[PDB]
Each structure stands twice: as C-alpha cells, then as structure tokens.
C-alpha cells in the first residue's frame, strides 16, 4: 500500500494546500475515517533485541533485530509469530522455540506499562471486525525529527519528537489523522485537503510524510 500512499501524498502536496487565499481545513474533516489501529507506545531497544510496541487496542508486539515479529493479542494469551520471510503462525502463551522471544515480549510489555503514556488514549478507535487479525510492525526507523512506523495493514505513522505531534496515514481510506501538540485530534480525507487546503504546519508534515514514504520504499 506504500505505492498508493505515495500517489495520494504526491497529489495532496502538488495542490500546495497552505498556499491558498483562504484555508478551510475544518471542511476537510471526516471523523468516520479515524483508524482502527495505531501505535500507542514504543520502546527502541535495538542495541540488543529490537523495537517493542503497543497498539491502541492494548495488544503488544515486538519487531526483533532478526526481522521476525511476535504479537500478543489483548486477550493475553494468543500469539502470532511472523518470520522474516512473512510466514505467519498462530500460537498461544499457554512451542519451546519461542520461549526466549515470549519472555522478551513480556519484558517490553511490562516496561511500556511501567513508564509510558498511551498515545491517542482519548480517541475512540473506529470499530471494525472484532475477530480480525492484528496488523504487525513491518519496519520502522528514526530520523532527526520523527520515528516512522509502518504497519502490515498499510498504515504509516509518524511521531514527531520536538512537539509530540503525530500523523497516522491510512491509504485504504486515503485519509490522515493528525494529533496536535495539545493532544486534540482530527481526521482528514486527503482529497478534501486538496479542495479546502490546510495550515502551513500540516502542509509541512505532509511533505515530510512523502519523504518518509519514499525512504520506506527505498528500504
């Protein structure tokens, strides 16, 4: 979905949405496109093990340094293991081959609970299918300005370090959710931002997002 996201971002940015006589950003809001999933917490222990994270439904996962992923559902028992080549297996906490990674996941779990806030804690996620499988973390990287997190459902999340603003890009709905410095949040359809425009801050973050999606595609 990265190629689609790149096309959507190229389109919104070419419209120069902040270079307008009157920006009407509010008219581009569409609260129904709020995501089902985003990353609420993360821990970069890549010096040793990998990147642990929590999704907004309170499930957790780890992308290990060997590019494998282990996800624990919010039921506290169900696991999905994803190999480097993408092969998926469904297991429970209740194989010996995964004992070490399960232990690491629990420790990441505990650390996130002990030390970190839940991003978007005040946001009601969109309701989807209670029985659907969780997305997992495909890859991530850190720049001067942000951490970039790409989920297997196509979503790309960019969390900015300086002001704690966050972008969640959802290419299936061609939408973006923006969490601002005050933790207020809005969801926009990118096509409506073309129509109505947006402020320089959001325009800058959307240019930055396209740069990040290009980096993801280059990786």
């Amino acid at each position: 979905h990265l190629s689609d996201m790149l096309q959507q971002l190229h389109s919104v940015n070419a419209s120069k949405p902040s270079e307008r006589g009157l920006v009407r950003q509010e008219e581009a809001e569409d609260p129904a496109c709020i995501p089902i999933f985003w990353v609420s917490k993360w821990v970069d222990y890549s010096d040793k093990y990998g990147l642990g994270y929590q999704l907004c439904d309170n499930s957790v996962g780890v992308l290990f340094n060997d590019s494998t992923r282990l996800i624990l559902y919010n039921d506290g028992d169900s696991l999905q293991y994803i190999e480097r080549d993408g092969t998926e297996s469904y297991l429970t906490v209740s194989p010996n081959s995964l004992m070490k990674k399960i232990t690491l996941l629990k420790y990441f779990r505990n650390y996130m609970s002990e030390h970190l806030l839940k991003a978007g804690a005040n946001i009601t996620p969109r309701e989807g299918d209670e029985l659907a499988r969780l997305p997992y973390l495909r890859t991530w990287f850190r720049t001067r300005s942000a951490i970039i997190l790409h989920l297997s459902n196509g979503s790309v999340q960019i969390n900015f370090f300086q002001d704690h603003t966050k972008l969640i890009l959802c290419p299936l709905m061609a939408a973006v959710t923006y969490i601002d410095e005050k933790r207020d949040f809005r969801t926009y359809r990118l096509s409506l931002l073309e129509e109505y425009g947006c402020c320089k801050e959001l325009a800058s973050r959307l240019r930055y997002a396209r740069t990040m999606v290009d980096k993801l595609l280059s990786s």
């Binding site: 821990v43 970069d44 650390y111």
Partner: peptide
C-alpha cells in the same frame, strides 16, 4: 533504551 513519551 529510547522510547515514546
């Protein structure tokens, strides 16, 4: 380790 807020 580095981490979120």
């Amino acid at each position: 380790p580095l981490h979120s807020t």
